[PDB]
Each structure stands twice: as structure tokens, then as C-alpha cells.
């Protein structure tokens, strides 16, 4: 079916749960041996949130090459995109070296440090210019360049360094500050201006390295933010946008990284995104 009168159908028959637990019964299930080892406990945030071992993103490293992060690759779409959790406190400094030697130019943060009382990532960038931040264990710096405050989302400059050859390079943190503590947003417009401030950047483009996406487990915020982008992708790339079928390319993506889209709201989110995105494309 179509999209938007599929969704109306959805709506008026209240048959979401329905369809998000298929999604669920169909999803692909491939090992995560790498992920459960004992001496990568303290690299998971949940454990129940695992990178498959086939699309894990391996770090450059002979002690440990272990990080909770996951390749993306839509191969219609000529898109890939890293799924990774908010960083842990002992995980930082892997975060940073992750971006470096996957050439990323763009980094997307989708949750606020703390939520609901609690904290859903360690505070992983310098919130000065003048208090830069080194990794010891990875031999990177990392500088606040410059910082712009809107009001439903932050942008800023980073300079990243490797201090092995110094080189050095420019990193742009994309920041969704709006996201509800409970639930999903009411509209998405928002969010679609925010999306396409990522994209104006260059940071989604084929010439950089896959950008990095995250929110706190790394599954769920962030499986909307590129489920909708891939469908926006395809409907503009096809003869027939109508084709474009968004439960079958959530089930792509879930070939890579287990678990994207928490619950049948961010299902319906993710559908009333690609509705209204679509017409303004045009
Ligand atoms: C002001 N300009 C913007 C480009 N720029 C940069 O560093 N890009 C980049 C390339 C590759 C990579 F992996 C990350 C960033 C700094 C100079």
C-alpha cells in the first residue's frame, strides 16, 4: 500500500501494536560473540543492546578492538550511516578514535546528557573554548571551536587532533535538544529542519567517511532519524515514490544493528515524518 493512506488505515483501525510486533517477529537475529566476551562488560551501556558481529565497527587497535557502534550500508540508497550508544565514562576516548579512523565529518547526538534524572551519556565534548580535552588512552585532542544555540537544536565546531602525527581536522556536532523525556514529539517538523541541517552540511555526502549517530542506546532515536532520511533518499531517487515501502526498509536496516525503532510510537513517528518530508521536498 501507499504510505500516508496506510497510515490513516493504521490510525483508524488503532492496529500499531499489531504491526510493530510483526516487525519485531520478522527482524533478522545474527551472532554478537564479540559483544558478550567478559572483558568488554564495561563497554556496554545495556545488556540487551549488542552490535552483530558481521557490521560491528572495529577499532584500529591489537589490545581490544571492541566498540558498541554498528555500519549502516543502503545499498539503493548509496547511504551509510554508524549506529552507536552515548558514550561511557570508560569508552570516550574509543568513541574519538572511532570517528578519526572512519574519516567521519559529522557527528548527530538525538538525547540530553541527563533525562529523566539519570544520565544517558558521559559529557564526551568540551563545553569551553579555553578547557580542550585530551584521551590519553587514545592519544586524541579535542577543542570547542565555536558554538551556536537554537532553539530546538545546537551546532557546533570541534577540532579533533591526533597527537601520534598531528594532524588535525574539523568535526561538526549536530545536537536535537528537544526530544521529550516521555514519548515522542507532537509534530515533526522540527525534527525535519534538523535532518536537513545535517544533510546542508555535507556530513551525510559520499566524500567523508559515514557519519555517527547516537542517542542513549543507540537504537531507537537514532533509528528514526535514518530510517526517515533513507526514505526520503529513495522517494526522490525512484520513478514511483508511492513503491517506497518503510517497513521493508526498516527490516534492511535491521539486518545491521538489532533492535531500531523502541516501540510502536516511534513506528508511527517515524511514518508521519516521511509523510510531511515528503512534500516539502517537493
Ligand atoms: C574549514 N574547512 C572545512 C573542512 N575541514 C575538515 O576538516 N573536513 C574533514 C575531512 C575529513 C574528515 F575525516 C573530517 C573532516 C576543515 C577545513
Redesign the pocket.
Given at each position: 500500500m501507499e504510505m500516508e493512506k496506510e497510515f490513516e488505515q493504521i490510525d483508524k483501525s488503532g492496529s500499531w501494536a499489531a504491526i510493530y510486533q510483526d516487525i519485531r517477529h520478522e527482524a533478522s537475529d545474527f551472532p554478537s560473540r564479540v559483544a558478550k566476551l567478559p572483558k568488554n562488560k564495561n563497554r556496554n551501556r545495556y545488556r540487551d543492546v549488542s552490535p552483530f558481529d558481521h557490521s560491528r565497527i572495529k577499532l584500529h587497535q591489537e589490545d581490544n578492538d571492541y566498540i558498541n557502534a554498528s555500519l549502516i550500508k543502503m545499498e539503493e540508497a548509496q547511504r551509510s550511516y554508524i549506529l552507536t550508544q552515548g558514550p561511557l565514562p570508560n569508552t570516550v576516548g574509543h568513541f574519538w578514535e572511532m570517528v578519526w579512523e572512519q574519516?567521519?565529518?559529522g557527528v548527530v547526538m538525538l538525547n540530553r546528557v541527563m533525562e529523566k534524572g539519570s544520565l544517558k551519556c558521559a559529557q564526551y565534548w568540551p563545553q569551553k573554548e579555553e578547557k580542550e580535552m585530551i584521551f590519553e588512552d587514545t592519544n586524541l585532542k579535542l577543542t570547542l571551536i565555536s558554538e551556536d544555540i537554537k532553539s530546538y537544536y545546537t551546532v557546533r565546531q570541534l577540532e579533533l587532533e591526533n597527537l601520534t602525527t598531528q594532524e588535525t581536522?574539523?568535526?561538526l556536532h549536530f545536537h536535537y535538544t528537544t526530544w521529550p523525556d516521555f514519548g515522542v514529539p507532537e509534530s515533526p517538523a522540527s525534527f525535519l529542519n534538523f535532518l536537513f541541517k545535517v544533510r546542508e552540511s555535507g556530513s551525510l555526502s559520499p566524500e567523508?567517511?559515514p557519519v555517527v549517530v547516537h542517542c542513549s542506546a543507540g537504537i531507537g532515536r537514532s533509528g528514526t532519524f535514518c530510517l526517515a532520511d533513507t526514505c526520503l533518499l529513495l522517494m526522490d531517487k525512484r520513478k514511483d515514490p508511492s513503491s517506497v515501502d518503510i517497513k521493508k526498509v526498516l527490516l534492511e536496516m535491521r539486518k545491521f544493528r538489532m533492535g531500531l525503532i523502541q516501540t510502536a510510537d516511534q513506528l508511527r513517528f517515524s511514518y508521519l515524518a516521511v509523510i510531511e518530508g515528503a512534500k516539502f521536498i517537493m
Open positions: 574519516k567521519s565529518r581536522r574539523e568535526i567523508h567517511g
